[PDB]
Coordinates of C-alpha atoms and ligand atoms in Angstrom, one line a residue:
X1 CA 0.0 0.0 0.0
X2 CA 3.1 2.5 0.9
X3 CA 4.6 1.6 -2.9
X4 CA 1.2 2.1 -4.1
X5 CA 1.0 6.0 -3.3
X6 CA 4.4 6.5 -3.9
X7 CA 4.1 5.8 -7.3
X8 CA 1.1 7.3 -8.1
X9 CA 2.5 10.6 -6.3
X10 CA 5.5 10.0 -8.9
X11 CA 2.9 10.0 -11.4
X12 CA 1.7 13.2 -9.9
X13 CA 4.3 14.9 -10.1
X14 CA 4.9 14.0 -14.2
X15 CA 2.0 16.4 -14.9
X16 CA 3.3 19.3 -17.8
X17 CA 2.1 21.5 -15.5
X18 CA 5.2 21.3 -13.5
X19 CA 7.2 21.8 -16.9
X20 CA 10.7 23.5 -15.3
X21 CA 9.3 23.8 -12.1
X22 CA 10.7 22.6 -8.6
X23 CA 8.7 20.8 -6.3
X24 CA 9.5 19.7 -2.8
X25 CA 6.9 17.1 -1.6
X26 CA 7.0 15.7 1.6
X27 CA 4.5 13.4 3.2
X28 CA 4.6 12.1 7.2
X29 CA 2.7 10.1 9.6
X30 CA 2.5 12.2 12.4
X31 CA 1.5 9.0 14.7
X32 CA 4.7 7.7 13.7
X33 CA 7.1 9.8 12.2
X34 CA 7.7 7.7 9.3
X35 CA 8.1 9.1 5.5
X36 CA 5.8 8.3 3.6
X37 CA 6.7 10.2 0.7
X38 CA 10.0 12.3 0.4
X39 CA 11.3 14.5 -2.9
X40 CA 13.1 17.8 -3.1
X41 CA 12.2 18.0 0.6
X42 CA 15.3 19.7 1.4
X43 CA 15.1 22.2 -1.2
X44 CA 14.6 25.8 -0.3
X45 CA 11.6 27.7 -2.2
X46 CA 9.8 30.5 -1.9
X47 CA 6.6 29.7 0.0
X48 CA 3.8 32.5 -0.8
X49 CA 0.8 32.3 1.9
X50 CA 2.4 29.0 3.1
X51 CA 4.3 31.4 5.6
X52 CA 1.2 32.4 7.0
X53 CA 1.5 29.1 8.7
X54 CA 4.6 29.6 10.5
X55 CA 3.8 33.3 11.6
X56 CA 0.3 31.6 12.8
X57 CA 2.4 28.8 14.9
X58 CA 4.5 31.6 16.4
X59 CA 2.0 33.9 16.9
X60 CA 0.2 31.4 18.9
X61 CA 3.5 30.7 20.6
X62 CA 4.2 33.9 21.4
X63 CA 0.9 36.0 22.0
X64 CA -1.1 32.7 23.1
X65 CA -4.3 31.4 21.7
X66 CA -6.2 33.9 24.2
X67 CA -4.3 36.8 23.4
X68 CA -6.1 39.9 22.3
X69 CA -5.7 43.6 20.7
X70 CA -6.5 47.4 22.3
X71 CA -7.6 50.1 20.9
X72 CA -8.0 53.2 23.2
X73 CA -9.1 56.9 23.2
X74 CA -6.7 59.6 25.5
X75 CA -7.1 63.1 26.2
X76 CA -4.8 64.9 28.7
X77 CA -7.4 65.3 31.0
X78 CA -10.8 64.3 31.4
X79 CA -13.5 66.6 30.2
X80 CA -14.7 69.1 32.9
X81 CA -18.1 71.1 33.6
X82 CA -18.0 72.2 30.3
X83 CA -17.5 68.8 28.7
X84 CA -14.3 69.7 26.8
X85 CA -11.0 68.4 26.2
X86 CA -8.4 69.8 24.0
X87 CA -6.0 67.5 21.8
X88 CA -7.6 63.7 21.4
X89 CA -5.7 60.8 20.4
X90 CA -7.1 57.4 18.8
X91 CA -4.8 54.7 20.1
X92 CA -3.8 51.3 18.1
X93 CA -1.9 48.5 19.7
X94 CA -2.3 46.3 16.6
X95 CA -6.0 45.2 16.2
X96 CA -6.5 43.5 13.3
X97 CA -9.8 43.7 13.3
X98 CA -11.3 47.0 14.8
X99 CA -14.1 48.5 13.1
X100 CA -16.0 51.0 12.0
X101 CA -18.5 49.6 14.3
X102 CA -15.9 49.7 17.3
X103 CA -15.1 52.9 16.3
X104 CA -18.6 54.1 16.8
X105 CA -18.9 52.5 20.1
X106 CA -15.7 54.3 21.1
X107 CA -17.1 57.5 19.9
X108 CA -20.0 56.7 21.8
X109 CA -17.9 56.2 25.2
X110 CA -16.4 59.2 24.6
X111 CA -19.1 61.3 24.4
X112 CA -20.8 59.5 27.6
X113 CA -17.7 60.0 29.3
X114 CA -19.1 63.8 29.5
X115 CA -17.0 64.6 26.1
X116 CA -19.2 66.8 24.1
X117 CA -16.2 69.1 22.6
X118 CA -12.9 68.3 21.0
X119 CA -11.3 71.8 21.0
X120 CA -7.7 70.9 19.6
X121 CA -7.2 68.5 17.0
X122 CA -7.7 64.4 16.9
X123 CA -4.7 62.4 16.5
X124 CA -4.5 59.0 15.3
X125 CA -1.4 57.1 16.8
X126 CA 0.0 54.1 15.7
X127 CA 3.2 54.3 16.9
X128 CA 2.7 50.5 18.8
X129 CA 4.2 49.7 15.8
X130 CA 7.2 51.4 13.5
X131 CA 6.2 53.5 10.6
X132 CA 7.2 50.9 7.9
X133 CA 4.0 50.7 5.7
X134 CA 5.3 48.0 3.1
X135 CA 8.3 45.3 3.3
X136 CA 11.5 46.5 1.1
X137 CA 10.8 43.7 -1.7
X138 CA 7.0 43.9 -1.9
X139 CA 6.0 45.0 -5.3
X140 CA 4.9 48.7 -5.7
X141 CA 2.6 47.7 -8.5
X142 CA 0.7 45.1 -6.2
X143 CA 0.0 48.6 -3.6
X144 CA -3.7 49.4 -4.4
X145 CA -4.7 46.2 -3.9
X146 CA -6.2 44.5 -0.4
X147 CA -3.7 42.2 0.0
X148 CA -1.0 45.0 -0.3
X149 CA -2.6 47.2 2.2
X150 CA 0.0 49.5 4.4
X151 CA 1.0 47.8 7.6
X152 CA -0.3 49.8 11.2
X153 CA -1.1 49.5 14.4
X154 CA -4.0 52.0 14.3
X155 CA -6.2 50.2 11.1
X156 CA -9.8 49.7 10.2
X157 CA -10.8 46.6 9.0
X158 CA -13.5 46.3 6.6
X159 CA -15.9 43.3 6.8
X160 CA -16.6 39.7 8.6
X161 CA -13.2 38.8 7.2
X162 CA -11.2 42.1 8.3
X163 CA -9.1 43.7 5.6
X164 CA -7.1 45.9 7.3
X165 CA -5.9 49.6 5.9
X166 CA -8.6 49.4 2.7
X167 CA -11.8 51.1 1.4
X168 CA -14.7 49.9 -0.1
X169 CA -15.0 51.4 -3.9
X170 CA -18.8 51.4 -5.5
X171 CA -18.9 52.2 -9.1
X172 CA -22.7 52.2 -10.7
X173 CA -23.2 52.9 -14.0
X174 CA -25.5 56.4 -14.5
X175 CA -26.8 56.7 -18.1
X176 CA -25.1 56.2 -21.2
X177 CA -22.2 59.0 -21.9
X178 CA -22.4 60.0 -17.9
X179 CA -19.5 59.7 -16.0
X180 CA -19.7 56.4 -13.6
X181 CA -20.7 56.8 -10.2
X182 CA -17.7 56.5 -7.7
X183 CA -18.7 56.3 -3.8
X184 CA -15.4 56.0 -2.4
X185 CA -16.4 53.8 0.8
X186 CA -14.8 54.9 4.5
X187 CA -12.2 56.7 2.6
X188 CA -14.9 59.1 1.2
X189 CA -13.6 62.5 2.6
X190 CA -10.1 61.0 3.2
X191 CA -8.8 59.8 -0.3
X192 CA -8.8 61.6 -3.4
X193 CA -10.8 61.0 -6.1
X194 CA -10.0 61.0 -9.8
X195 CA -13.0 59.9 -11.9
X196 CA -12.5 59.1 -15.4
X197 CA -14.7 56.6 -16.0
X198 CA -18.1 56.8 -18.1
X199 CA -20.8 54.6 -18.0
X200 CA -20.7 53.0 -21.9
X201 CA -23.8 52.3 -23.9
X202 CA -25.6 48.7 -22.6
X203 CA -24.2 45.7 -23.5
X204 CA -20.8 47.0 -24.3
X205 CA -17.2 46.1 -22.4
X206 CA -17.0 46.4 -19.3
X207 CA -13.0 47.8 -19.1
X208 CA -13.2 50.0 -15.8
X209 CA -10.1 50.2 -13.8
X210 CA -9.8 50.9 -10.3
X211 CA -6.1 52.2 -9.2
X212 CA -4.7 54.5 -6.6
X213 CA -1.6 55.8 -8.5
X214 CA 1.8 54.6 -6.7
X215 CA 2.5 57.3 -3.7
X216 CA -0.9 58.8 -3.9
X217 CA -3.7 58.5 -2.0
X218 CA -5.9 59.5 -5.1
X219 CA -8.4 56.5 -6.0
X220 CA -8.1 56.7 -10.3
X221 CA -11.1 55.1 -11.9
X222 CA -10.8 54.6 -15.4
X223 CA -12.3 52.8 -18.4
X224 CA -16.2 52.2 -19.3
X225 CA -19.0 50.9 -16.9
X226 CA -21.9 49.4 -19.2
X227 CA -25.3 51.2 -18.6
X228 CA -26.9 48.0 -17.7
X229 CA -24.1 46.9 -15.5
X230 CA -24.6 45.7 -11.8
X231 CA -22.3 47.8 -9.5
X232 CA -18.8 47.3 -9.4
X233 CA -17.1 47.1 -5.7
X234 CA -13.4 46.8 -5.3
X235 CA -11.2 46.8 -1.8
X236 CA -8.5 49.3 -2.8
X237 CA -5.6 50.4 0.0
X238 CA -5.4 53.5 1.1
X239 CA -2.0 55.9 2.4
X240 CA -1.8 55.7 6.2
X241 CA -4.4 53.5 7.6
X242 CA -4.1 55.1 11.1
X243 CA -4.9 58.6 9.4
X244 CA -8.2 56.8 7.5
X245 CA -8.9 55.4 11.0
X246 CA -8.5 58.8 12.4
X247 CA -11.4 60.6 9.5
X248 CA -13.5 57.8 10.5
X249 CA -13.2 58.2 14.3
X250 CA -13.5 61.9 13.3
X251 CA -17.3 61.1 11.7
X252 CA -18.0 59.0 14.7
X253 CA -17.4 61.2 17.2
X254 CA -19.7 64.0 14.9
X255 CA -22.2 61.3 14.6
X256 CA -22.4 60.3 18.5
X257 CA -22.6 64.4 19.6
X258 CA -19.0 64.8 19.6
X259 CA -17.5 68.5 18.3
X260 CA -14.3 67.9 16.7
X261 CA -13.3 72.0 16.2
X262 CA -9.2 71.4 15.2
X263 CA -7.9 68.8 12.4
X264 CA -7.3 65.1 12.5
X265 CA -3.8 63.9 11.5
X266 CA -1.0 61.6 12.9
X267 CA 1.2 62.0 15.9
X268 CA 1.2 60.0 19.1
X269 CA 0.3 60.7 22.7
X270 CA 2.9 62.7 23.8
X271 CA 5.9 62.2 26.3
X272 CA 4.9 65.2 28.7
X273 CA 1.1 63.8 29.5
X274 CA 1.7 62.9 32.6
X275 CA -1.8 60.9 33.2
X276 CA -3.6 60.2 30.4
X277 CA -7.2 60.4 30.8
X278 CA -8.5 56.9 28.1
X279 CA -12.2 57.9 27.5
X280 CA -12.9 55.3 25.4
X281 CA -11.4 51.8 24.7
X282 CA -12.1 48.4 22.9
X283 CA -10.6 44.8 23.4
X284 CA -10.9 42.9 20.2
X285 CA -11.7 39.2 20.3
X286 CA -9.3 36.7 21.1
X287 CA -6.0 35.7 19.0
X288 CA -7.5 32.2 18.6
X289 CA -10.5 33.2 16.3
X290 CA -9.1 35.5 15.2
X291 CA -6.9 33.2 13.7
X292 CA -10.1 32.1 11.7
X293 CA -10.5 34.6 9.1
X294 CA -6.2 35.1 8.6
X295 CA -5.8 31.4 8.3
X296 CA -9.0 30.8 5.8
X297 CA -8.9 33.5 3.9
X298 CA -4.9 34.4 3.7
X299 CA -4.7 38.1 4.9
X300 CA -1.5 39.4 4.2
X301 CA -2.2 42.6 6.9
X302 CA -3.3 40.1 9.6
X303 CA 0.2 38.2 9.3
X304 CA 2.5 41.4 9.0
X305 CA 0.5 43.4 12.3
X306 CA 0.8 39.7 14.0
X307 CA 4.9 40.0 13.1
X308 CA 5.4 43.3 14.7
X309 CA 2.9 42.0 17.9
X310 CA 5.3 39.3 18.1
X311 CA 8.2 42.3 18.0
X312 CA 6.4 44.0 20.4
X313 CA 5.9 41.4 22.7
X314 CA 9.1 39.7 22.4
X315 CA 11.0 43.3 22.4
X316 CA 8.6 46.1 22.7
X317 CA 9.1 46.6 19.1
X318 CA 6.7 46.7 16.7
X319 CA 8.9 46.0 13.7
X320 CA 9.4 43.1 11.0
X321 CA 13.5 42.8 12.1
X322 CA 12.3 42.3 15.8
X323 CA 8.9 40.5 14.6
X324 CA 10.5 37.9 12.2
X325 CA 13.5 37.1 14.8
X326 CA 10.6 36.5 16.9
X327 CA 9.3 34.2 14.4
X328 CA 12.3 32.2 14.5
X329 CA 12.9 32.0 18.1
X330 CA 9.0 30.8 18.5
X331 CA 9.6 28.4 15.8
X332 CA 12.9 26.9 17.3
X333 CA 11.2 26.6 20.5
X334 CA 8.6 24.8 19.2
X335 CA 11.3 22.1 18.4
X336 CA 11.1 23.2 14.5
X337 CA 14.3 23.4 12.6
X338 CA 14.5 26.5 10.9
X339 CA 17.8 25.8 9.3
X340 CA 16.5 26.2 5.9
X341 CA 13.7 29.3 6.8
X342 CA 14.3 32.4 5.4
X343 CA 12.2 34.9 6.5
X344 CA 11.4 38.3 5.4
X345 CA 7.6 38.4 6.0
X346 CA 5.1 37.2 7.7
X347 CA 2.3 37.0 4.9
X348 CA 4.2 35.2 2.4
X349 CA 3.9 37.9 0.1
X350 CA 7.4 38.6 0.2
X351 CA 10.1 36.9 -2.7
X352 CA 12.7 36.9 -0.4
X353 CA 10.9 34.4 1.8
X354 CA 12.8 30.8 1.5
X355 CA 11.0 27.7 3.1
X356 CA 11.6 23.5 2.4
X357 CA 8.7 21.1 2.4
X358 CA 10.8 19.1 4.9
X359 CA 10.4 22.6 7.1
X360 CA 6.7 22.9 6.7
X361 CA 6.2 19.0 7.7
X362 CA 8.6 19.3 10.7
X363 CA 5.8 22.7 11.7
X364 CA 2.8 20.6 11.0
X365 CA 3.8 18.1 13.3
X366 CA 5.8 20.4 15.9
X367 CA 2.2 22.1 15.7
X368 CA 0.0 19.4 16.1
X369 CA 1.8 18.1 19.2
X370 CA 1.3 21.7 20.8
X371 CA -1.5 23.6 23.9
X372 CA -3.2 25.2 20.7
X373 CA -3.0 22.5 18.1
X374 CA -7.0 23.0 17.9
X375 CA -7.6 26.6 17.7
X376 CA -4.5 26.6 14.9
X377 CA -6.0 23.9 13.1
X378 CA -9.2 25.6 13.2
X379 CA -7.7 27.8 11.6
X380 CA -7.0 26.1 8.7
X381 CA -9.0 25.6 5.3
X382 CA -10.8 22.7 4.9
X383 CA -11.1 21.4 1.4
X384 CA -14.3 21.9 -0.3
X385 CA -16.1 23.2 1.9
X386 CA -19.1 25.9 0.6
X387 CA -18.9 28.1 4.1
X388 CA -16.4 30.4 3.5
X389 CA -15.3 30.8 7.0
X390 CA -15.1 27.0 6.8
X391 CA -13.5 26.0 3.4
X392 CA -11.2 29.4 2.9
X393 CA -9.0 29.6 0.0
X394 CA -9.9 25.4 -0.5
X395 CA -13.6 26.4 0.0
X396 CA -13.9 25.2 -4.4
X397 CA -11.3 23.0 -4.6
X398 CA -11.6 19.0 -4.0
X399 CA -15.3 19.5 -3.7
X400 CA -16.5 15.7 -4.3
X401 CA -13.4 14.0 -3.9
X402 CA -12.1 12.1 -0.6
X403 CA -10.4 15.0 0.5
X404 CA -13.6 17.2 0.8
X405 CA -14.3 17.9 4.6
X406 CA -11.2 16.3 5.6
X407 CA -8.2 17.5 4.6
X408 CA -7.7 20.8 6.5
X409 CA -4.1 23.2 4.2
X410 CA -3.1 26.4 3.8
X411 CA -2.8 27.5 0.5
X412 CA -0.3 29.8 -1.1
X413 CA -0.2 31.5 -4.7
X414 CA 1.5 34.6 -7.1
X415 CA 3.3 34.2 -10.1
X416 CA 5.5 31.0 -10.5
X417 CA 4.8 29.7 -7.0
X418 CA 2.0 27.5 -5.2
X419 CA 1.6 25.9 -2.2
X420 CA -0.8 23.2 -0.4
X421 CA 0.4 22.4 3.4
X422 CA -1.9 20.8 6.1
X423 CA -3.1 17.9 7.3
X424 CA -4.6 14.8 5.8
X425 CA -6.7 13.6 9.4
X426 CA -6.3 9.9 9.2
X427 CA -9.0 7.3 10.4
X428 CA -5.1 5.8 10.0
X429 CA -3.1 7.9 11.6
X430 CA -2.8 11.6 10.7
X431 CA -1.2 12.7 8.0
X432 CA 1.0 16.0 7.5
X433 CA 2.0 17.2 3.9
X434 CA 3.8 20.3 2.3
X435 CA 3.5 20.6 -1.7
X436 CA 5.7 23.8 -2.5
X437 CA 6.1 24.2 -6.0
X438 CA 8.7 27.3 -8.0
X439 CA 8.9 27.7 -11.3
X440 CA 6.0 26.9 -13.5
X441 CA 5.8 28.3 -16.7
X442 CA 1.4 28.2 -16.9
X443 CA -1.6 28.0 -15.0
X444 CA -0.2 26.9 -11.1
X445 CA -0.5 23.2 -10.5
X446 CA -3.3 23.4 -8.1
X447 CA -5.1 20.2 -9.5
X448 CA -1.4 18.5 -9.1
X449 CA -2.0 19.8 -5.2
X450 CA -5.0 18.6 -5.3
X451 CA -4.2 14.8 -6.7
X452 CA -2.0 14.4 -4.3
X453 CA -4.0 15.8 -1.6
X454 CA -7.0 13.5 -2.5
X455 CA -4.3 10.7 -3.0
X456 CA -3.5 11.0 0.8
X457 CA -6.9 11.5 1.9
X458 CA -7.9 8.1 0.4
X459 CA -4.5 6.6 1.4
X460 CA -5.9 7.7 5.0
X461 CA -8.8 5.8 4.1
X462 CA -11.2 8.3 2.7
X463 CA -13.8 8.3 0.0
X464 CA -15.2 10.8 -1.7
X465 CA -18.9 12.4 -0.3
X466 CA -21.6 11.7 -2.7
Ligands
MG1 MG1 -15.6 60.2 5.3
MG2 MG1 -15.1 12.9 4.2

């Protein structure tokens, strides 16, 4: 049965689609620690989301499963008779999921703490963490988009799945010749707008374009919206998600009776308030589902402000350098040999990120073994499943196959690399596997990841659901 898999992974692995590609393929029983399948295992490759899992591992190492964020509202003083304070500050400590909805109900603390005028300016601070919005090798190009989104400790997250540092863009077609609609989301008031776009005649090509021009904070919409079209929404990034967070705190405090007379920009509580009065605060849920939406859905944002936590909690610096080492140490605690891990991200967005499939394994099962095995694998996509918040990334792939509600991976894609690393939860024993693949010229080999995933969930004794 063992030299029946490992030649049909063999056979896996002859697919075109891996055409000048490198592929490290590892497969263990985690009962047992044998090999079950072993090739390029050793080989270092760039993982894409697959890092998420080891900044998951060690965030859960570090922070612990029951870990959660702050987010608090200071003024030098409370407010008096008259109900005002001067200068107010909007405090992050890294909450990757605050918002506009906590905001509100911060606001509304704020103006129940007897606030009813802001007379100096409001500040958004998020200097919990360092000012470095992007990593060095991140691609400028890839900056509008969600998955790109600057990296702060003072961020609002939009939705149930909690992109960080981004703004909702609605663009409805008016009539024929009119220029498109553009509501600009939370960053209306806040980004720039630059409407090109016209709504074409009905029935024609739908060629509208949604950028924020590198070193902007100008949303450009361009192209041709069909009369007839449904609405267009797009998550585009915005410049300084604290300063977003700020305008949006600003309307929230306006909306809940709150005057806000001066400006709202950066800056940080300063050095010479001696007892800083917090009018308002919020606790965000706990690290451990938290860990839900990151793991499921891959957020880039989630993984980086979980790096510089880890710097902050391991050094009181909230900084990728400090964060990563962090990473590292965690891992190597954890009994994981990080002898072939490169690490220049958290995400996995990164190219200068280096992993081996033997590295992954020796995680899944360091991880398995460990207080939060659960909440981590929780965490996890499970393939083919229709519940987003359940199947993730996997949630339409291996649908009716003996891998579907079983096999629980993270996934990892961009150009020339993919990756499939989990679990394969054996009525046997169960299974760890990492599939990190390089190279590949063409579409990514995701049904290859998927053979062998399905391969190992019916070596484990599975069949598919009908
Ligand atoms: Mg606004
Ligand atoms: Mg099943």
């Amino acid at each position: 049965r063992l030299t029946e898999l490992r030649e049909d992974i063999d056979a896996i692995l002859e697919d075109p689609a891996l055409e000048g590609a490198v592929s490290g393929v590892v497969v263990v029983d985690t009962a047992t620690g044998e090999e079950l399948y072993s090739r390029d295992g050793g080989e270092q490759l760039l993982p894409a989301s697959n890092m998420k899992l080891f900044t998951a591992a060690a965030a859960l190492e570090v922070l612990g499963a029951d870990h959660s964020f702050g987010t608090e509202v200071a003024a030098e003083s409370a407010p008096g008779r008259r109900g005002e304070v001067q200068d107010l500050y909007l405090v992050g400590r890294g909450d990757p999921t605050l918002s506009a909805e906590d905001l509100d109900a911060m606001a509304a603390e704020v103006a129940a703490s007897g606030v009813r005028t802001v007379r100096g300016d409001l500040y958004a601070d998020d200097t919990w963490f360092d000012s470095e919005r992007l990593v060095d090798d991140w691609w400028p190009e890839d900056e509008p988009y969600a998955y790109s989104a600057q990296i702060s400790a003072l961020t609002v997250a939009h939705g149930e799945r909690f992109d960080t540092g981004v703004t909702e863009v609605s663009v409805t077609p008016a009539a024929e010749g009119e220029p498109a609609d553009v509501d600009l989301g939370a960053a209306e008031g806040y980004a720039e707008l630059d409407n090109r776009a016209v709504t074409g005649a009905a029935g024609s090509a739908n060629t509208l374009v949604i950028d924020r021009p590198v070193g902007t904070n100008t949303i450009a919409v361009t192209g041709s919206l069909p009369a007839d079209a449904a609405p267009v929404t797009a998550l585009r990034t915005v410049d300084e998600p604290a300063a977003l967070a700020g305008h949006l705190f600003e309307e929230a405090l306006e909306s809940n009776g709150v005057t806000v007379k001066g400006d709202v920009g950066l800056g940080g509580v300063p050095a010479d308030w001696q007892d800083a009065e917090v009018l308002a605060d919020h606790t965000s849920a706990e690290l451990s589902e938290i860990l839900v939406p990151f793991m499921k859905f891959s957020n880039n944002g989630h993984a980086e402000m979980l790096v510089k936590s880890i710097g902050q909690e391991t050094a009181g610096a909230g900084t990728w350098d400090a964060g990563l080492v962090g990473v590292e140490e965690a891992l190597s605690g954890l009994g994981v040999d990080t002898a072939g891990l490169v690490l220049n991200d958290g995400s996995g967005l990164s190219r200068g990120n280096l992993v081996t499939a033997d590295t992954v394994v020796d995680l899944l099962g360091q991880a398995g073994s460990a207080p939060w095995a659960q909440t981590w694998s929780a965490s996890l996509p499970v393939a083919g499943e229709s519940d987003p918040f359940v199947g993730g990334t996997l949630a339409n792939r291996m649908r009716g196959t003996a891998a579907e509600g079983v096999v629980e991976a993270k996934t990892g894609t961009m150009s020339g690399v993919s990756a499939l690393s989990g679990y394969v939860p054996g009525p046997e024993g169960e299974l760890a596997f990492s599939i990190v693949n390089n190279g590949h010229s063409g579409p990514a080999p995701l049904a290859v990841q998927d053979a062998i995933a399905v391969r190992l969930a019916e070596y484990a004794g599975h069949q598919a659901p009908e």
